[PDB]
Amino acid sequence: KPRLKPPFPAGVGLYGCPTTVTNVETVAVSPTILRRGPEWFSSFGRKNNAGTKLFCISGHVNRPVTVEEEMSIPLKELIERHAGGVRGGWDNLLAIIPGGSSVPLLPKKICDGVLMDFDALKEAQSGLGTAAVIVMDKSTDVIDAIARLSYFYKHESCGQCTPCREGTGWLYDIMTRMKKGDARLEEIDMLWEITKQIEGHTICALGDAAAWPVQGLIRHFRGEMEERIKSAGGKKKLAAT
Amino acid sequence: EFATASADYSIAMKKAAEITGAAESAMGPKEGGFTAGVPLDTFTRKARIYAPARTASQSGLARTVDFATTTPAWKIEFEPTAKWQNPLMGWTSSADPLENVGRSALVFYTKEEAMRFCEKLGWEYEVTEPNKRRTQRTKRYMQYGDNFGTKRAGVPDLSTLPSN
Amino acid sequence: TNSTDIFNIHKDTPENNAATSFEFSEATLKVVNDIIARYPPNYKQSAIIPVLDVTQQENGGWLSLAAMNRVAKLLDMAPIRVYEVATFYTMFNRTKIGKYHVQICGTTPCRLQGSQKIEEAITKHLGIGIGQTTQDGLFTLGEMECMGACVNAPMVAIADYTKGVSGFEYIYYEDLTPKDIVNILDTIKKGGKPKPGSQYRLKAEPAGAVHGGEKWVPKDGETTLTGAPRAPYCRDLNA
Amino acid sequence: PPSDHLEVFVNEQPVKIPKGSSVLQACDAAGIDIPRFCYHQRLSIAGNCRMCLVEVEKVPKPVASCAMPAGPGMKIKTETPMVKKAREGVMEFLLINHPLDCPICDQGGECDLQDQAMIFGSDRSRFVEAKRAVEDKNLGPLVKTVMTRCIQCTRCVRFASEVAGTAELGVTGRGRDSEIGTYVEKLMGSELSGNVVDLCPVGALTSKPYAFTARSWELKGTESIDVSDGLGANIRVDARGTEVMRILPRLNEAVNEEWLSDKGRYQYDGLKHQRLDKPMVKGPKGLQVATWQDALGAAAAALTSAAPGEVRGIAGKLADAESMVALMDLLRGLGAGDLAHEGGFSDMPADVRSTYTANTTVQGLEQSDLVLLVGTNPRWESPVFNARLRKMFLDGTQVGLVGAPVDLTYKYEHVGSDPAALAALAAGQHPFLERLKKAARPAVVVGPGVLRRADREAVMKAVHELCGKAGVVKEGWNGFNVIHDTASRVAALDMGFGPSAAARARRAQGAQPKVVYLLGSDDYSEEDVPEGAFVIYQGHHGDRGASRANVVLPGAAYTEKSGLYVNFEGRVQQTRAAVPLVGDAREDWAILRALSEVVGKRLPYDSHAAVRARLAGIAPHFANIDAVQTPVWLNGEYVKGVEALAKAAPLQPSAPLTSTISNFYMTDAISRASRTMAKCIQARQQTK
Amino acid sequence: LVYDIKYFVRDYRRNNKYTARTVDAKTTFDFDKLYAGMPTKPEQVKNVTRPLIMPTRGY
Ligand code: SF4
Ligand code: SF4
Ligand code: SF4
Ligand code: FES
Numbered sequence A: 001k002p003r004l005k006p007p008f009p010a011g012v013g014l015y016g017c018p019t020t021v022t023n024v025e026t027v028a029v030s031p032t033i034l035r036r037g038p039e040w041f042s043s044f045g046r047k048n049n050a051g052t053k054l055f056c057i058s059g060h061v062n063r064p065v066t067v068e069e070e071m072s073i074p075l076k077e078l079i080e081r082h083a084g085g086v087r088g089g090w091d092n093l094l095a096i097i098p099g100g101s102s103v104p105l106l107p108k109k110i111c112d113g114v115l116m117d118f119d120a121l122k123e124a125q126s127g128l129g130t131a132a133v134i135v136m137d138k139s140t141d142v143i144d145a146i147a148r149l150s151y152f153y154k155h156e157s158c159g160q161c162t163p164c165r166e167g168t169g170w171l172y173d174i175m176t177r178m179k180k181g182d183a184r185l186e187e188i189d190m191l192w193e194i195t196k197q198i199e200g201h202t203i204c205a206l207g208d209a210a211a212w213p214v215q216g217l218i219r220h221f222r223g224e225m226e227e228r229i230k231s232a233g234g235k236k237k238l239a240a241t
Numbered sequence B: 001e002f003a004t005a006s007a008d009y010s011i012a013m014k015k016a017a018e019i020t021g022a023a024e025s026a027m028g029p030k031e032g033g034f035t036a037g038v039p040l041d042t043f044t045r046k047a048r049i050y051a052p053a054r055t056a057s058q059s060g061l062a063r064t065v066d067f068a069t070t071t072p073a074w075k076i077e078f079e080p081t082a083k084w085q086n087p088l089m090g091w092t093s094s095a096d097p098l099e100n101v102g103r104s105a106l107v108f109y110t111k112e113e114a115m116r117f118c119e120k121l122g123w124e125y126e127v128t129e130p131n132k133r134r135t136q137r138t139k140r141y142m143q144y145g146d147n148f149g150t151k152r153a154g155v156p157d158l159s160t161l162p163s164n
Numbered sequence C: 001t002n003s004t005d006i007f008n009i010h011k012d013t014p015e016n017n018a019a020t021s022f023e024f025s026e027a028t029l030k031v032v033n034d035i036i037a038r039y040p041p042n043y044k045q046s047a048i049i050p051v052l053d054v055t056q057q058e059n060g061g062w063l064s065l066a067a068m069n070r071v072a073k074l075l076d077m078a079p080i081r082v083y084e085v086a087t088f089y090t091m092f093n094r095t096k097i098g099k100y101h102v103q104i105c106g107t108t109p110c111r112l113q114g115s116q117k118i119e120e121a122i123t124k125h126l127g128i129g130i131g132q133t134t135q136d137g138l139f140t141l142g143e144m145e146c147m148g149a150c151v152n153a154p155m156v157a158i159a160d161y162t163k164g165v166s167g168f169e170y171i172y173y174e175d176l177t178p179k180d181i182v183n184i185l186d187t188i189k190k191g192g193k194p195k196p197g198s199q200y201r202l203k204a205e206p207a208g209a210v211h212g213g214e215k216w217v218p219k220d221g222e223t224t225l226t227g228a229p230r231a232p233y234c235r236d237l238n239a
Numbered sequence D: 001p002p003s004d005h006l007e008v009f010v011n012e013q014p015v016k017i018p019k020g021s022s023v024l025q026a027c028d029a030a031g032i033d034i035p036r037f038c039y040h041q042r043l044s045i046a047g048n049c050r051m052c053l054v055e056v057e058k059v060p061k062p063v064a065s066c067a068m069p070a071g072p073g074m075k076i077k078t079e080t081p082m083v084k085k086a087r088e089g090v091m092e093f094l095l096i097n098h099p100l101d102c103p104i105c106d107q108g109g110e111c112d113l114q115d116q117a118m119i120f121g122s123d124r125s126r127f128v129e130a131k132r133a134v135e136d137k138n139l140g141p142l143v144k145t146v147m148t149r150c151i152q153c154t155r156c157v158r159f160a161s162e163v164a165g166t167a168e169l170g171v172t173g174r175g176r177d178s179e180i181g182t183y184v185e186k187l188m189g190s191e192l193s194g195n196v197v198d199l200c201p202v203g204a205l206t207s208k209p210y211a212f213t214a215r216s217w218e219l220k221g222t223e224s225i226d227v228s229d230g231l232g233a234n235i236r237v238d239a240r241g242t243e244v245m246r247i248l249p250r251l252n253e254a255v256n257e258e259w260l261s262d263k264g265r266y267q268y269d270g271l272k273h274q275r276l277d278k279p280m281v282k283g284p285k286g287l288q289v290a291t292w293q294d295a296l297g298a299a300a301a302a303l304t305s306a307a308p309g310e311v312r313g314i315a316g317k318l319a320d321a322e323s324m325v326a327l328m329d330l331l332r333g334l335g336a337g338d339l340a341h342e343g344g345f346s347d348m349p350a351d352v353r354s355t356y357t358a359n360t361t362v363q364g365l366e367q368s369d370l371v372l373l374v375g376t377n378p379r380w381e382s383p384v385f386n387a388r389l390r391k392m393f394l395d396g397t398q399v400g401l402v403g404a405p406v407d408l409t410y411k412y413e414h415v416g417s418d419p420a421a422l423a424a425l426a427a428g429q430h431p432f433l434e435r436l437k438k439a440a441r442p443a444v445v446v447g448p449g450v451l452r453r454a455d456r457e458a459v460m461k462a463v464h465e466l467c468g469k470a471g472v473v474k475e476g477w478n479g480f481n482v483i484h485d486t487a488s489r490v491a492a493l494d495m496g497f498g499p500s501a502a503a504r505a506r507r508a509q510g511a512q513p514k515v516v517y518l519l520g521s522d523d524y525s526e527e528d529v530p531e532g533a534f535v536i537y538q539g540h541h542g543d544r545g546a547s548r549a550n551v552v553l554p555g556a557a558y559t560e561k562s563g564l565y566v567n568f569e570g571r572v573q574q575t576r577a578a579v580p581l582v583g584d585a586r587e588d589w590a591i592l593r594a595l596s597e598v599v600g601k602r603l604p605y606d607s608h609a610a611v612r613a614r615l616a617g618i619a620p621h622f623a624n625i626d627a628v629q630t631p632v633w634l635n636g637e638y639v640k641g642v643e644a645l646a647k648a649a650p651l652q653p654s655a656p657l658t659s660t661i662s663n664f665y666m667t668d669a670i671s672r673a674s675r676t677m678a679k680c681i682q683a684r685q686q687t688k
Numbered sequence E: 001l002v003y004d005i006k007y008f009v010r011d012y013r014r015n016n017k018y019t020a021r022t023v024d025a026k027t028t029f030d031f032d033k034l035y036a037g038m039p040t041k042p043e044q045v046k047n048v049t050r051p052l053i054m055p056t057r058g059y
C-alpha cells in the first residue's frame, strides 16, 4: 500500500533510510554507457531523448518480437520492419497503444507519421509508457479491449484510497453496458466526467493509469461507441414496441 | 486587508449593535427582572452559564467555541425539576416553567453577554470555562514521515549481510 | 484476490480449522532460516512473503490457518498482519486445490491472440470452468492477469505441487493453440514433462505467429543480432 | 529562536503556525473547518479519504492537507471551482457503494458522512448498478458491526493499534473487496473498546447496548464526570425524559482527552434495577414502606439510644463530599468519633495533600522520560490513565514496574515483585537505579492497593528513600505521585474524614458498636459491621448493605444530583443532575440535615451553597472548581515525623505488591447490577 | 440534469453576498443629472413594462 509524497524515498525510504528505486533496463545500460561513453549514447535520438530502447511488439503483428532499436524511430518503420508489418497489411490497422496499457492509444491517422519518442507521443496526447506495442486490426472490438483493460485495472487496484477503489468497478460496469449498447449518448459525457473525477485526485497514479485508456478511447472512437449505442436499439427496442 | 466572514448579513448585525447612544444603555441588578412581570420565584433558582462541548459522535466544529465570533454559543440552563409519567399513557409529566426556554432560545456570543443578561434579570449564575482544544500533535506520528521513520525498531543493523 | 477464494475471512472445515496441525520439515526450516538471514534482525518481519510461499509449497499448494499461525509465531509478528498479507496477494491460495494449478492470462494482448479459444478448449477437455477442480484432484484451472509473455501470447503457466518445495516447478507454456495445450495436459496426465516456453520457437526472437488463435503461420523477415558477439571494449577514462 | 512560527497564506490570509504543522492544521488556525473523514487528532496521519484535497499555487494537483506539510510562502485556496468539484466527486465516490441504510442506521442525525454530503456534496446520483454486499462481523457484545456501511476510513485500525495497543483489527482483501475486521472470530479484548464507535464516523460500528434505542436529537446533553474510578473522566449524559439513554465522553486534555473506560461507558444500565424509591423501616414482619418522618424518627431514636462510642459511620465509593462532611459533622456533634471508608486505609494520616496525590499531575506526567510503578495496575485501576501511559511510551518514555507482572499493552522492565526487591533497588543492587539516577525527569507512581497494606508506612518510607537517592523530587519537578481507584476517597482525605485515636484504640482492643450507618456502602468488611447491630442505610440501589439494613433512606444517584468529587491529582470536579430524582428520593445532605434536626442538633447550614462554603472553610481549594493547586512539599520532615508508625507494624518483605482490584467489570453495586458487565464477563468466560 | 449532476454552478443560495460599502459622507449627489434624465413632453415618456413571469432558469 503506497505512501504519499512528500516525503520522498531518498529523504525517507526503506526502514526510514535513503533509498532509490530504479528500473532494470535503466540500471543495466549504465556500465555500457559508462564504458562506451555518454557522447556515444547521445549520438542517437532527438534532443532530450537520446539513446536506444528495448521494444516489445505484440497484438495482430506478423512477427511479434522484443527488439532493441534506436529511439525516435517511426511506428510504421518500427512495425513494418523488424516485425513483419500488420497482419493483413498496414491498411488493416485500426489502433495501437505504443506504451503498454496505461497510456492513451492512437488511431491509424495519428500512428502513421508519429515517432516513438517521449516528447513526440506526449504532444499527441499519449505517452511512450514502457514502449510496449499492442496492435489491433479492423476485425477487433476496440470497446471490448478497453473494457477488458478496465476489468484488469479493477482487479489490480489496491483500494487504499477512495476514488480509485470505488470507481474501478463503476468504470468497468459503464464499459460493460457500453459493450452491449445498454447506455445512452449523454452517459458518454458522464463517463468522461467520471474519468476527470478520478484523475489526479487519488493517492497514487494508478487512478490515472485506469482513467487514461478510456479517455483516449472516447476521444478517438466516439463514433464507434455511439454507433453501438444506437445499434442496440435494433435488437432491444423491437421488443419494447 | 479585513476578511472575517465578509459575505453575509452578519455584518449588518455586527453594526446597529454598536450604535452610539444605543450602545451605552445599562441596568442595575434584578432591575430588568422587575420589568418581566413573571412570578418573583423565577429568580430563586440557579443557572448555568457555559458553552456545550463538542460531541464525540462527529468531527464537526461549527457549533463550538472555535467559531465564537461567528455565532452566539453561550447557553443558560436551569436545574431539572421533578418529572414523572402519565398513569394512562406513560408520557413524561412535569410542571417546570423553565424547562426548555434556555436550551432553545438563550444564545450568546460571549460569556459576558450572559453575565449581563443574568445580572439585569437577577438570575444567580455559575461560570464554567470550557476546556481548550489542543492542536499540537504528539512526538510520535508528528508528521506523515514519522509513520515510516527509524523510530519504529531503530537503525537497521548490517550484520545479516553476506560476509557480515 | 484470485479464483477459488471468495472469502476474505476464515471459514470452518474439518480439513481447515483451529485444530489443524502443521509443522515445518527440517529442510524447510533450514531453507526458511537461510531466507531469514536476508534481512536485519530488527526488521525480521520483512521476510513474510517468501516464508508464506515456501509454506505454500510445503503444505502442497495452499496455506491453512494453522500454517499462518505457525508462520506468525516463527516471525514473531501478530497473526493479523499475516492474514492481511495472505489475503492481499494473488498467488497465495487459502483453500485446498488440486495437484497441478493451471493459470491463464486474460489480459487484452493475450485476449486478442485467442485466449478465449484456449479457455474454451480447456473447459471442453478438462470438463471444468474457472474456479473449479477436477473430480480426481489433478488439474486446477485459474485465471490470471498479464504474465509478462505478451510477445508469445497466448500463454499459460502451470504450477506443480506433487514434488514439494525442492521439486516445485513453475513452467511457462507459450505460443499455444488448443491442440498444443490439450497435448501438454495429456503429457502431464500420462507422467511426461511438457517442453517449456513457446511451442514453435525458442524465445522472443522474431518468428511466425498464431493467426486467429488456431494456427501457427511462420513468416520470414529481418532478424537482428545474427552476427558474432561484440568483443570487450572500454574507452579512455582519463583526459 | 530560528522562527519556530513560520508564515503561509490561506486565501490571502497571513496565519502564523508552528513548524511541522500541516495545511489542515493551518486552515484550522485560519478559521476554516475543511471536510475530512480519515484524519483524527489523536491518531496517525492516514490520508486515504481524499476529502482534504486543497489547492496550492504552483501545484497542478490537489494536495492532501491532512498530510501535506506547509512550506514558507505557501498559498492555499479552499473555494475554487476545482476544490468544490473534487469535493463533490469524492462524496459521489463515497456514496456509490454505501448501502441505503439511513432509516435503520443508528448514526442518522449525527452522521458526519450525511452532513458532509449535505454541505459539500450534490443532490442527485447517476449510479444505478449493484452495490457491494458485505457480511457483518462479531467482536463481542459491546459493539454492533454493520460492515456494509464501512467507508474504510481505517480509523478503527489505527485506534486499536495505537491507543488500545491490542492491534487486533486490520484490512483484509483488496480493492473494492477490501474488508475490515479480523480474519478469525475474535472477541475484542480491549478495555477501552467503546471509543471505536465514537471514533467511527459512520454507522458501521455501533454500540450494541445502545442500538435502536433512541435518536441523538431526542436526548438532552448534560456534561458530567466519571465516578466509576478515581480519575474522574469528563463525560456528557444523554437522556430522554427521566431515563438515561447513553453516556459519552467529552474533551478534557488534562484529565482524559477523548477517552472513556467501557466500565464507565456501559454501567448506566444498572440505574434501572434494584432502585430504592421509598423509605423503609424494619418491622416485626420485616422492612416496610414508611414515611420520611417515620424513618427519620426511628433513626433518631436508634442513634440517641446508644452511647457516642457505640456509633460508627462508613463512607462508600460514590458518596459525595457534601454528604460526607454533613455526616461527619452529625456524628461529631453527638460525641461519636468512629469513621470508616469503603475505599480502605481510613486510618492513613492526611496532613500534607502531596503525600496522597499525583504531584506531577496527569498532563505534567507526559514530561517524564522515565516512569516507575510501585505495586499498581493502571490498566485495571484506570484504563484511560493506562492509555495515556501508553501514549507517553510511544515517544521514548521508559517505564519500570515493582510488583506483579501483568499485561500493560507496552514493553517494560520488571524490577521485582516484593518489598525486598524495592529495598535492593534502593540499595544500588539493580541497574534500574542508575537509569533513574541519570534520567532528567524521573517519575514514580504508587497505586492505592499499596496504601491498603498493613505496613504502608514502611513502603512509603522505602519509596521516599528511593526518591531521595534518585532525586525524583527536586527543583522545578516532582515525579512523586499517588493515585486512587475511588472518587470519594480524595474528598474524605481533604476534609479530614478520619477516625479518632480513641476509636482506633477501641478497634485495637476490639470494641464493637451498636449503631452503624452506611452512606451508600456495599463492599464493607464483616469486622466493621457486627451482626445483630442496628443498621441505618442510605443509598439508591438495593444491594448487600440494603438487605442487612434495618432502616433505608432512598438517596440520590450521581446521575440525578450535582456532587463534589476530586480526583487523585487534587483537581476539584463536580457532577451534574441530568434526570430528576427517582421515586421519593431526596438530597443526601438534605437527608442528613433533616436527621440532624430530628435528633436535636441542627447543622448550621441550610443550602447547597452553604454546605459548599462550609467545605471551603474546612479546606480553601474546594472553591476552585475545575482547577488544581500546587501542593507544598516538606521534604523528609514528614517521613521523619511518621517514624513511629513505621516502627510499629514493621515491614513485611514477603507479601507481593499486588492490585486489590480483582473484578474490573464489577466494583460497586451499580457495576454489580449492570447487565452489560455481566454479559462481558460471560463472554470472557465462554472463550474457554 | 439527469447525468450532469454538478452543483457548484447552481448553488445560488450559499453564494449571495453582503458588502459594507465606503462611508457615504463626502459624496457629491448632482441632482442635475437626476433631473436631466426626466421627460418634458407628453411624448418622450418611457414606461417600464410589467414583467410577465418570475425567473425560471430554464425549468
Ligand atoms: S489509486 Fe487505486 S491502486 Fe492506487 S493507491 Fe489509490 S486505491 Fe490503491
Ligand atoms: S452511516 Fe450515515 S450515511 Fe451511512 S447509512 Fe448510516 S446514517 Fe446513512
Ligand atoms: S469500521 Fe468504521 S472506523 Fe473502521 S475503517 Fe470502517 S468506517 Fe473507519
Ligand atoms: S497480456 Fe498475457 S502475459 Fe501479458
Ligand code: FES
Pocket: D036, D037, D038, D039, D046, D047, D048, D049, D050, D051, D052, D053, D064, D065, D066, D067
Ligand atoms: S484527511 Fe486528508 S485524505 Fe483523509
